[PDB]
Amino acid sequence: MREIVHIQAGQCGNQIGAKFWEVISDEHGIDPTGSYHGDSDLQLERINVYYNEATGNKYVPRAILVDLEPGTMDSVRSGPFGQIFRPDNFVFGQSGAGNNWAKGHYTEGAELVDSVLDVVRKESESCDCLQGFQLTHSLGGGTGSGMGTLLISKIREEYPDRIMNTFSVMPSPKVSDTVVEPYNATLSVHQLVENTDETYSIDNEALYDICFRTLKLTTPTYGDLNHLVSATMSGVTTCLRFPGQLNADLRKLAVNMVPFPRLHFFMPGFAPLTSRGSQQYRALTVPELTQQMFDSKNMMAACDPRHGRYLTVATIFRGRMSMKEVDEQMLNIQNKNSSYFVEWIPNNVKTAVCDIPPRGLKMSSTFIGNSTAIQELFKRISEQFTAMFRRKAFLHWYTGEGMDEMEFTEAESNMNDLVSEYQQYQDATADE
Amino acid sequence: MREIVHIQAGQCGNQIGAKFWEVISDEHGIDPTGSYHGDSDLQLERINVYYNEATGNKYVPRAILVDLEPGTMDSVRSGPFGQIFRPDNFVFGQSGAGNNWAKGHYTEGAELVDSVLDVVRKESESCDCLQGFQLTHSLGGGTGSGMGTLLISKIREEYPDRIMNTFSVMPSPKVSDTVVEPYNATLSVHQLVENTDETYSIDNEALYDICFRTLKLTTPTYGDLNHLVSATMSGVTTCLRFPGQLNADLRKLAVNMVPFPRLHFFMPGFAPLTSRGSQQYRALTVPELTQQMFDSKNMMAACDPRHGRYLTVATIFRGRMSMKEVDEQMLNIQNKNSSYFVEWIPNNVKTAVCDIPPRGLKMSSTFIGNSTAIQELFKRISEQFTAMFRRKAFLHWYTGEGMDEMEFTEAESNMNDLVSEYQQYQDATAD
Amino acid sequence: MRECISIHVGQAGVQIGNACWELYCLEHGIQPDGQMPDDSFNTFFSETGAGKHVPRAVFVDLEPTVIDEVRTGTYRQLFHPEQLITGKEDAANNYARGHYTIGKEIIDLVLDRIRKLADQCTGLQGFLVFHSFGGGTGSGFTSLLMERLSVDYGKKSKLEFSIYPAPQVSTAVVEPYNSILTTHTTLEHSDCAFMVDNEAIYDICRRNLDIERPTYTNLNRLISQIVSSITASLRFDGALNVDLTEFQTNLVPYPRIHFPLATYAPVISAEKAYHEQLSVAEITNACFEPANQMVKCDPRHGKYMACCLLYRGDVVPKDVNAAIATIKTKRSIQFVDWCPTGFKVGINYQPPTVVPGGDLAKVQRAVCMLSNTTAIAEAWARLDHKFDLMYAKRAFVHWYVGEGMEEGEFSEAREDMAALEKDYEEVGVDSV
Amino acid sequence: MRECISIHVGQAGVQIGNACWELYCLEHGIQPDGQMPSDKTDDSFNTFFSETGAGKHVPRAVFVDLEPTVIDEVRTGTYRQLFHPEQLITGKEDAANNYARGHYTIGKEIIDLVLDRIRKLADQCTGLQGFLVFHSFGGGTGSGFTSLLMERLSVDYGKKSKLEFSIYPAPQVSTAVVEPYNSILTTHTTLEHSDCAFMVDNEAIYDICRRNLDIERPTYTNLNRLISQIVSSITASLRFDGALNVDLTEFQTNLVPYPRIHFPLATYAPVISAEKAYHEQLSVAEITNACFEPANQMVKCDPRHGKYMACCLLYRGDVVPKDVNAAIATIKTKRSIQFVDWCPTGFKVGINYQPPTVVPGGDLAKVQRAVCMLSNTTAIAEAWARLDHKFDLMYAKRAFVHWYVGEGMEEGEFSEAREDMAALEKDYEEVGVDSVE
Amino acid sequence: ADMEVIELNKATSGQSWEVILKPPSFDGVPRRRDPSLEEIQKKLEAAEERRKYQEAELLKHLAEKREHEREVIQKAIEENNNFIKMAKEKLAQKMESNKENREAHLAAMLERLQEKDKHAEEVRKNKELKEEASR
Numbered sequence A: 001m002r003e004i005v006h007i008q009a010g011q012c013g014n015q016i017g018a019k020f021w022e023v024i025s026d027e028h029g030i031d032p033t034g035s036y037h038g039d040s041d042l043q044l045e046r047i048n049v050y051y052n053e054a055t056g057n058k059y060v061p062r063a064i065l066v067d068l069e070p071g072t073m074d075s076v077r078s079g080p081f082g083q084i085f086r087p088d089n090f091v092f093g094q095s096g097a098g099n100n101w102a103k104g105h106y107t108e109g110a111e112l113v114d115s116v117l118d119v120v121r122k123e124s125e126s127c128d129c130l131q132g133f134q135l136t137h138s139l140g141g142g143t144g145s146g147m148g149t150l151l152i153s154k155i156r157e158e159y160p161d162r163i164m165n166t167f168s169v170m171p172s173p174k175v176s177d178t179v180v181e182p183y184n185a186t187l188s189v190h191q192l193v194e195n196t197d198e199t200y201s202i203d204n205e206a207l208y209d210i211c212f213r214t215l216k217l218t219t220p221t222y223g224d225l226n227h228l229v230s231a232t233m234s235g236v237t238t239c240l241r242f243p244g245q246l247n248a249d250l251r252k253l254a255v256n257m258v259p260f261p262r263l264h265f266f267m268p269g270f271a272p273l274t275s276r277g278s279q280q281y282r283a284l285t286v287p288e289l290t291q292q293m294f295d296s297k298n299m300m301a302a303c304d305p306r307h308g309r310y311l312t313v314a315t316i317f318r319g320r321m322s323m324k325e326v327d328e329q330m331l332n333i334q335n336k337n338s339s340y341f342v343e344w345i346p347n348n349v350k351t352a353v354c355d356i357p358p359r360g361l362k363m364s365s366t367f368i369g370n371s372t373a374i375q376e377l378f379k380r381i382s383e384q385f386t387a388m389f390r391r392k393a394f395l396h397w398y399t400g401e402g403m404d405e406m407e408f409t410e411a412e413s414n415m416n417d418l419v420s421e422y423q424q425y426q427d428a429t430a431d432e
Numbered sequence B: 001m002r003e004i005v006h007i008q009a010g011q012c013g014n015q016i017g018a019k020f021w022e023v024i025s026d027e028h029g030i031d032p033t034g035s036y037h038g039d040s041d042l043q044l045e046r047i048n049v050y051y052n053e054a055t056g057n058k059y060v061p062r063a064i065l066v067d068l069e070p071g072t073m074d075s076v077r078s079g080p081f082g083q084i085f086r087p088d089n090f091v092f093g094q095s096g097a098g099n100n101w102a103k104g105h106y107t108e109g110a111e112l113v114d115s116v117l118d119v120v121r122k123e124s125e126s127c128d129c130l131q132g133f134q135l136t137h138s139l140g141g142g143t144g145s146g147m148g149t150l151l152i153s154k155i156r157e158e159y160p161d162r163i164m165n166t167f168s169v170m171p172s173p174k175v176s177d178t179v180v181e182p183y184n185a186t187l188s189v190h191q192l193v194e195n196t197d198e199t200y201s202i203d204n205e206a207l208y209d210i211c212f213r214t215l216k217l218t219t220p221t222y223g224d225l226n227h228l229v230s231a232t233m234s235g236v237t238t239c240l241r242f243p244g245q246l247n248a249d250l251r252k253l254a255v256n257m258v259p260f261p262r263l264h265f266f267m268p269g270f271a272p273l274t275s276r277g278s279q280q281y282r283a284l285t286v287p288e289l290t291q292q293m294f295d296s297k298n299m300m301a302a303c304d305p306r307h308g309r310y311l312t313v314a315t316i317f318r319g320r321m322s323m324k325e326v327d328e329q330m331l332n333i334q335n336k337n338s339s340y341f342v343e344w345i346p347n348n349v350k351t352a353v354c355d356i357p358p359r360g361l362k363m364s365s366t367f368i369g370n371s372t373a374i375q376e377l378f379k380r381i382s383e384q385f386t387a388m389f390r391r392k393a394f395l396h397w398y399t400g401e402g403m404d405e406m407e408f409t410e411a412e413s414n415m416n417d418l419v420s421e422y423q424q425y426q427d428a429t430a431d
Numbered sequence C: 001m002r003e004c005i006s007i008h009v010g011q012a013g014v015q016i017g018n019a020c021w022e023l024y025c026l027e028h029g030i031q032p033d034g035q036m037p038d039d040s041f042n043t044f045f046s047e048t049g050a051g052k053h054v055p056r057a058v059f060v061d062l063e064p065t066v067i068d069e070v071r072t073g074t075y076r077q078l079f080h081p082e083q084l085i086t087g088k089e090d091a092a093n094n095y096a097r098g099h100y101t102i103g104k105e106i107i108d109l110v111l112d113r114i115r116k117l118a119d120q121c122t123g124l125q126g127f128l129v130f131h132s133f134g135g136g137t138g139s140g141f142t143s144l145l146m147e148r149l150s151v152d153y154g155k156k157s158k159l160e161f162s163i164y165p166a167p168q169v170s171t172a173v174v175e176p177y178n179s180i181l182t183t184h185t186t187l188e189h190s191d192c193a194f195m196v197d198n199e200a201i202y203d204i205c206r207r208n209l210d211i212e213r214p215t216y217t218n219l220n221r222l223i224s225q226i227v228s229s230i231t232a233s234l235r236f237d238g239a240l241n242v243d244l245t246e247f248q249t250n251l252v253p254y255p256r257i258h259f260p261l262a263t264y265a266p267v268i269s270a271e272k273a274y275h276e277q278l279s280v281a282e283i284t285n286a287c288f289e290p291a292n293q294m295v296k297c298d299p300r301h302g303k304y305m306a307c308c309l310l311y312r313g314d315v316v317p318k319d320v321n322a323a324i325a326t327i328k329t330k331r332s333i334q335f336v337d338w339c340p341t342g343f344k345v346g347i348n349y350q351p352p353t354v355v356p357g358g359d360l361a362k363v364q365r366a367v368c369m370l371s372n373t374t375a376i377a378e379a380w381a382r383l384d385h386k387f388d389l390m391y392a393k394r395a396f397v398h399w400y401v402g403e404g405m406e407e408g409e410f411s412e413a414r415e416d417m418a419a420l421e422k423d424y425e426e427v428g429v430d431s432v
Numbered sequence D: 001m002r003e004c005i006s007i008h009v010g011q012a013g014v015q016i017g018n019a020c021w022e023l024y025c026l027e028h029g030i031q032p033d034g035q036m037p038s039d040k041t042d043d044s045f046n047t048f049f050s051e052t053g054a055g056k057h058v059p060r061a062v063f064v065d066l067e068p069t070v071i072d073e074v075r076t077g078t079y080r081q082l083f084h085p086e087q088l089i090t091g092k093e094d095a096a097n098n099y100a101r102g103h104y105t106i107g108k109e110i111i112d113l114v115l116d117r118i119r120k121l122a123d124q125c126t127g128l129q130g131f132l133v134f135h136s137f138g139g140g141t142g143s144g145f146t147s148l149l150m151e152r153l154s155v156d157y158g159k160k161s162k163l164e165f166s167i168y169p170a171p172q173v174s175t176a177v178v179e180p181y182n183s184i185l186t187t188h189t190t191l192e193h194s195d196c197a198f199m200v201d202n203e204a205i206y207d208i209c210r211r212n213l214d215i216e217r218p219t220y221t222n223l224n225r226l227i228s229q230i231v232s233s234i235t236a237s238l239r240f241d242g243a244l245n246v247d248l249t250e251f252q253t254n255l256v257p258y259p260r261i262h263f264p265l266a267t268y269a270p271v272i273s274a275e276k277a278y279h280e281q282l283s284v285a286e287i288t289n290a291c292f293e294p295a296n297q298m299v300k301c302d303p304r305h306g307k308y309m310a311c312c313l314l315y316r317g318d319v320v321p322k323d324v325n326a327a328i329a330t331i332k333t334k335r336s337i338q339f340v341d342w343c344p345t346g347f348k349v350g351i352n353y354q355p356p357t358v359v360p361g362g363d364l365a366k367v368q369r370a371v372c373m374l375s376n377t378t379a380i381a382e383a384w385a386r387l388d389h390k391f392d393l394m395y396a397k398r399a400f401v402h403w404y405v406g407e408g409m410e411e412g413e414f415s416e417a418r419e420d421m422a423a424l425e426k427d428y429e430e431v432g433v434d435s436v437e
Numbered sequence E: 001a002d003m004e005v006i007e008l009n010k011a012t013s014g015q016s017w018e019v020i021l022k023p024p025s026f027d028g029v030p031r032r033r034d035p036s037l038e039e040i041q042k043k044l045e046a047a048e049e050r051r052k053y054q055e056a057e058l059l060k061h062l063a064e065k066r067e068h069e070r071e072v073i074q075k076a077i078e079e080n081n082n083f084i085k086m087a088k089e090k091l092a093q094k095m096e097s098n099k100e101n102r103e104a105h106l107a108a109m110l111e112r113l114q115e116k117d118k119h120a121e122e123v124r125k126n127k128e129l130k131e132e133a134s135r
């Protein structure tokens, strides 16, 4: 389990993807020319997970950039780390999906698809020991959502033995690009439940609320939200891209986090929450860091973990700190909040400490939780879908592409069933 | 829709026709030799509607001169614009119908008809985009009435897709002692109802009354009445003869004016009313123009528009004036007199403004109205016809020519039906 | 690729075309000969071997008068003779002539030229059709063309710019007949149609531009500015772009309900000097005031189903989201219950260009809102009534029947209008 | 010459292997290059090291991992010259903490390869005693691969001694929620194939480091250096000219009364921090008493709550029989030390003169004498009971089971494994009762 | 109060002996093969067959999804095609119905003017019985 093949689909996918790539490149001592200039052998020890070593000194991200709209290609290349990416790995179509999941999944996307699979094949066959795939995309649009889910299905067929990991961004009316997001999101979730092993549920409702309420940003921008996303992505991938015992590969992470196959939707968490302008501030202690696991205010998914129960939790601490203190605090939290952890999964909270802190903070903590509380995010999408479907609003754009009302009925049913399952284990007692 | 083929039938037709030709020629800068001498590109822009260019820097009216009486041929040639017309176009018999519609329509007129169609065909096939025909004639005689209606029928057969427009002059006992005019007129109207698309009802009762009452002419002459006719003809054709958006061709005019096929008889109006060779000075104001032009005193047909309701109205203003003022005045008239405009034909009053004024006036207004009040003109002809027919007076003049009393019974019936239709829409409510 | 083909039908369509193409040229630096010393303008202009730029447009009229001005005018060198099509005799303000009698003579000729413009397209998005509802060419010829386009190009996007009739400038008593017959015949063939009410434009010129008696030149220069705001997203590469498909997807909830209301702001007379500069918030709010609308109706009384906002010039996303937030808090502005979020945004870098010697003043930023409101039903209702008044007495019907039309066709047309009216009612009923 | 072959499976096994072999080298004067200065001269060290033509000494050991990371350190490390490449075996992909993936999917790929080198090493032997297997209960390699290896070894080497050093899981250092599954599944498969197995409870080691060595946050380095000491104390008599547990057969005869109850409890003393003030060395009495203190045990359990069925005392260094008998006398007076009806209440006592050795720069202080008590007590049943409960909690809801079934395992195997644990638990109970007659 | 020491072994690196505190309380007394390699192979290969089976089953479902993908793409083709077919036949029937009506409209309008000619000549016959059968 060495190499990971990273894929970015649509505007959101590419926006969050580029940001991850600049964040982790800094952490690993890589400048935009692909040249290593760091000063720690720890930075390069597991560099092969995300980078291919190119001719001479240089390092090249194992990333595939995808979109049906050509514009985003230039948007990336113009970015700070634009010239770090392989030119061949840019697979861009001529006309976007026009916020229609059917177009990206069946019509215009089915094209671009094969030409994309050829790039993944070239990357994959080059691997000594392929771990699997990491896709970044939104569920709101037509490319990231529709085509991204088609990619997951076509990859799954070619590589059925590999881990499929996604950073799926959830739509919110609070920050939206299309009136049809409930259709696009519902149809995507159905596909994610069946075809992924681990999905990070990055909720735009959660990020907007963090920026507006906590960060006090009157008008949050995609920059402000992506500042929280990049932080989170850096945290959840710390165990993968640096030496350590806990959840060091995609499969060992899936084994510790996924008890039931369909229940693979993680609620990411992060402390401290900072604004792109919050260039101060010197603080945070170990108990301070630890308290934020139940602070719904710190969740990248719009659900209160106190409204449900944790099936499994992964906690990653960064910066120089006493592991004794970390272990003490971690025990204190579980022993005092025993009512939010399922009694039937003993020692379901695993903790790791990376000495290397992220840029900007001297100390940080990331939380990856498989909580039953995630049903609230799916209930929200479902109600929004019902509001529209009940009246068959905008449906003609979907059916026009060849889809049936049945496919909509089936996508909703699976989502209701998914919620119904989380509820089943939420109630589940460790008694005979 | 470019060219119009103009026809003049009988004494009246030729008299009014010559007058139109001199009026419009002056407006377009054409002297009697056919040579253009004007000073505005607007004058020639749509010259092709009425004139043929023909080999030579000069212009020739697309007019056909007709009569069963030879005298009128010379009367026109002796006129000021006599030498402007094509000599070949002058088609003249030897007889003269003697105020017998039967003679004009069946006997003497049918003999000359083919010789006339000879000239129309030559003119028509020469057109790049023939609009249709414009006939000038009286309904009181034999030639203009009888032969003129035969012509319309024969031109209708050859050109069924073209617009048929007439300037039909209505008889009056005030101007003519001819007793048979009600017969001739009734027989003609029957033909007009069936075979024309747009007819201007120029009433000699109305013109006599204008000259006698308004103009204070003790004994009005055909010269005095024709002065009003020429004014009117110049006005109604302005939209046709000059560039503009509204009623620019015969068909677009018919579409805006005719809601029911048979109700195609227009009541023309003019302001200011003037006598021959008379220079005011003092041109009317815009509210003056708008009000005057809507009075019964200003109608070329002998009916009170206030006695009926307007189905549709076209209003043309000529001279330099503020279009704002024109539009304001035009709205004021139709918002204050809402009881004279049918509620069921929204925005039935269309207005146009030509910068070029007619000769003699610095400012003028022409009114083309499809009013239900026109039934008064038809009722007058009908009463006059019944007075005679009841007693079978003069019937042998027509039966002699081979006509039957039924041809008469049928002509009257259709006219009673026509009146009965105008009455139907006069009463008609929107709801 | 992704090219649009503009079709300008009748006097109204051709004249607006003249305004549009004059403005596009100014906005792209193209001289009247087709020369120019982005790259997105190629969706609207073909390039020759001489380096000259030719509009992807066709001008059709059944009479030569108006197009003859184009071919003797300033831009006679811009269009190739073959794309300027004229007959000899117009449809005499009669739909039946434009559709059957006169139209049949030039139909094949026009489709041939369209087939040729489509041949030079590497990825045709669709068509932009400009016409009046009132004229016999605008009504009858357009419906005949739309029908033929559906046969030759199946389901390919077809969008209209329809001139709604105003009595102030109306030239035919029969415009309500022509309006209803065309709406009926076109309905199933158009994907989306932007109506421009002539009384609304007339009044904005009078009020905002201080024009006592507005002319077609004044009206068209204003219409051209809106049409440009709608096409800017296709002709330029801005901060956010909307394609033809994206319009239909975000503005059309149901196939019949395809008539968005256009509102443009700011409209300032080229005098004053103190009148500026208006903020993003100020210009946005203006889209919700009826004095700036393109169709005369009251949205206060109706409900919105979708809103699309096309910003141009000095516009920042943060300022736009701030402005939409304030609208989302206004009780007076109601949206339907089947619409979680009904907004779509576009942003272009280019401030609106003005024709030198024009009525409009230069502004640093502008916006055009395309909104689907049940209030547009008021415009159909006014036309339907005028139709009813005349049809009850069969006034003018003989002109239509004479050209081979059937009386039963008028009832079909009106019954379909009665259904359209009922569909606007049903859709606003919010509802179990 | 009676040779012993050591096998190290998975990360835990390989790393403890590194500690053990580093300590053996120090105890025998073998340098990391394998060169032993035998220049001035008991030969018993040869039961654990083959000699080459170059005069270098090579461990009779095999290191296996389904992943290269840990063994790659061995081949670049201090002792890379001690082991021959052939005895360091690695796959490319690990068993992802899944017994199934280790036993069924990935294991099958390297099994023949492993048995081949075991065969090779099994030849250079003029009187093979058997095998010493080092592995974790928790990981997918240590659980899944070991059980697969034990099975084939029974086929290839019919009735040859196989002894385990198994790492019992502690939540403090645990890396997988599924460790109780892997623990029970491996115990079940291995049971009939192992003759004797010494469990090392990670929480016990962790706590001894914290308490006695004053280590705030114990690392695998600290744990393994401790484990090694006990392992060395156990293997001493095989590697030196001893008298007690002088052959592997003896371990089994001396500590295993019944085939299934083959899990003796280890207790070591003294454990002293090297970084502390000088102290008057501990007496035989002091170190003996320490054997009956649960704070020094290798597995967390209470022998008060149990009965002994065999006891063995392994003294190292400066130890005199008179001092040992004096120490045993004192214990009996003050403490019960209950045995079973059948066994005599007593101890098999062996002294090994070779002094205890420590890794220089290590955590442990060098002592003049030490002791390791090996005792088969019914109290070890407490360790199975804790693991069995954790298994029950998860299995009731079938949590994580799909990971196993997905690798071709059957749900019935979990039932089979647990039923055998239920039987093992009952056997510890049954053995502690009164005998009849 | 009493102990028994039994010397066991004496050697170079050490000595061993047994200590008996108390003898046993009770004095009167309190194997299954193998396994086969063929049995191991049987179990190992049974699992391989259950794994290969569930991977195949999974692959069959991804195959079902593709077959459906072609079907919706096919539906959209048949819809655009049927649209073209409706539009073609509709517009043709309308063009034929109109040509029909329009031609008939002239047929009667000329037929009425033909009656006029028939009656005009007919009127000339009534005059013939009068004109010169006269005087």
Ligand SMILES: Nc1nc2c(ncn2[C@@H]2O[C@H](COP(=O)(O)CP(=O)(O)OP(=O)(O)O)[C@@H](O)[C@H]2O)c(=O)[nH]1
Residues within 6 Å of the ligand: A009, A010, A011, A012, A013, A015, A016, A068, A069, A096, A097, A098, A099, A100, A137, A138, A139, A140, A141, A142, A143, A144, A145, A169, A170, A171, A172, A175, A176, A177, A178, A181, A204, A207, A222, A225, A226, A229
């Ligand atoms: N945290 C973020 N969410 C984003 C961003 N851009 C978009 N989005 C969100 O994603 C959804 C809209 O999607 P996109 O831009 O990704 C659509 P995409 O380009 O994949 O497909 P098309 O339909 O072909 O345009 C929606 O929930 C937006 O609100 C971003 O930069 N950051």
Ligand SMILES: Nc1nc2c(ncn2[C@@H]2O[C@H](COP(=O)(O)CP(=O)(O)OP(=O)(O)O)[C@@H](O)[C@H]2O)c(=O)[nH]1
Residues within 6 Å of the ligand: B009, B010, B011, B012, B013, B015, B016, B068, B069, B096, B097, B098, B099, B100, B137, B138, B139, B140, B141, B142, B143, B144, B145, B169, B170, B171, B172, B175, B176, B181, B204, B207, B222, B225, B226, B229
């Ligand atoms: N406004 C005018 N009415 C006229 C004029 N001449 C005649 N009329 C009127 O027309 C009718 C008499 O007709 P005409 O001279 O036209 C008869 P026409 O010559 O067509 O045929 P004949 O029966 O062969 O004489 C009658 O109402 C006269 O009163 C005229 O010059 N102007």
Ligand SMILES: Nc1nc2c(ncn2[C@@H]2O[C@H](COP(=O)(O)OP(=O)(O)OP(=O)(O)O)[C@@H](O)[C@H]2O)c(=O)[nH]1
Residues within 6 Å of the ligand: C009, C010, C011, C012, C013, C015, C016, C062, C063, C090, C091, C092, C093, C094, C098, C132, C133, C134, C135, C136, C137, C138, C139, C163, C164, C165, C166, C169, C170, C171, C175, C198, C216, C217, C219, C220, C223
């Ligand atoms: N805004 C605007 N409206 C126009 C313009 N020209 C005409 N109109 C309007 O469009 C309708 C006029 O119909 P036209 O487009 O001129 O008729 P046509 O399409 O040429 O059809 P035909 O009858 O055959 O001439 C009325 O509502 C006019 O007020 C123009 O340049 N701008």
Ligand SMILES: Nc1nc2c(ncn2[C@@H]2O[C@H](COP(=O)(O)OP(=O)(O)OP(=O)(O)O)[C@@H](O)[C@H]2O)c(=O)[nH]1
Residues within 6 Å of the ligand: D009, D010, D011, D012, D013, D015, D016, D066, D067, D094, D095, D096, D097, D098, D102, D136, D137, D138, D139, D140, D141, D142, D143, D167, D168, D169, D170, D173, D174, D175, D179, D202, D220, D223, D224
């Ligand atoms: N004492 C000690 N315990 C260890 C060591 N390494 C791992 N463990 C423990 O062993 C269990 C994990 O098993 P590992 O040996 O690491 O995993 P593995 O055999 O490689 O199997 P895989 O899942 O295929 O990687 C947990 O209880 C760890 O705490 C070590 O070096 N020393």
Ligand SMILES: [Mg+2]
Residues within 6 Å of the ligand: A010, A011, A069, A096, A141, A143
């Ligand atoms: Mg996009």
Ligand SMILES: [Mg+2]
Residues within 6 Å of the ligand: B010, B011, B069, B096, B097, B141, B143
């Ligand atoms: Mg005469």
Ligand SMILES: [Mg+2]
Residues within 6 Å of the ligand: C010, C011, C063, C090, C135, C137
């Ligand atoms: Mg026109």
Ligand SMILES: [Mg+2]
Residues within 6 Å of the ligand: D010, D011, D067, D094, D139, D141
């Ligand atoms: Mg491992």
